[PDB]
């Protein structure tokens, strides 16, 4: 988990 990962919707299923 990275709190600063930039993807906003990509990583949501």
């Amino acid at each position: 988990f990275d709190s600063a990962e930039p993807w906003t919707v990509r990583n949501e299923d």
Partner: antibody
Amino acid sequence: EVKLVESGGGLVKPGGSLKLSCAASGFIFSNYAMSWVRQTPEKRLEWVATISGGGRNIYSLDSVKGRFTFFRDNARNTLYLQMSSLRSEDTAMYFCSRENYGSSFTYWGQGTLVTVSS
Amino acid sequence: DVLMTQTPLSLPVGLGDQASISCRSSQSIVHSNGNTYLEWYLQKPGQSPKLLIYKVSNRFSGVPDRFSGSGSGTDFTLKISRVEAEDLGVYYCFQGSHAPYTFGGGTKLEIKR
């Protein structure tokens, strides 16, 4: 509906600076992360950076850190790429692309060409 | 860094026939959230790349069922069940799991007239 249009590409001397823009329409811009992807003259694709919807979280190529700045103006539906200390390796077609649920580069623009040359 | 090894470099195929394009990653590309962000793009002549497949095997909206993706861990394959002239261009695999994100070198599909 969804439209992405890059601009600002052109000729710049090695060590020079250039600002690229990406204009977006047809969706709620700040709801989506945006990426910059470049295509080299040998036609390889290279991911350059990804920036969050709100514009404060960024992943980028280590080779462009300290040289390129990524940011967006969500009030104007525009993504920016501020290039400085340009190198010959930066010569490429630059594409902007919007993410979507489950996929990284869902919509692409037409690209803008950057030539780094004396 | 994750190297993506994509083969063949080009592929001549008759109209109506099948093609398989392979992609291997130099290490596992399972994202921290358990998903595998392996994607396939097609760049047609004179166009930008467009999304075909995401999360290894999911077809993007509008993409014909002729295209299917498979694989896991480090080995992935794009399969085209029967080729049409509109399928001409360069296919690229991409991993979005581990930064810096990386593309395969591409496969040029050609029609065997």
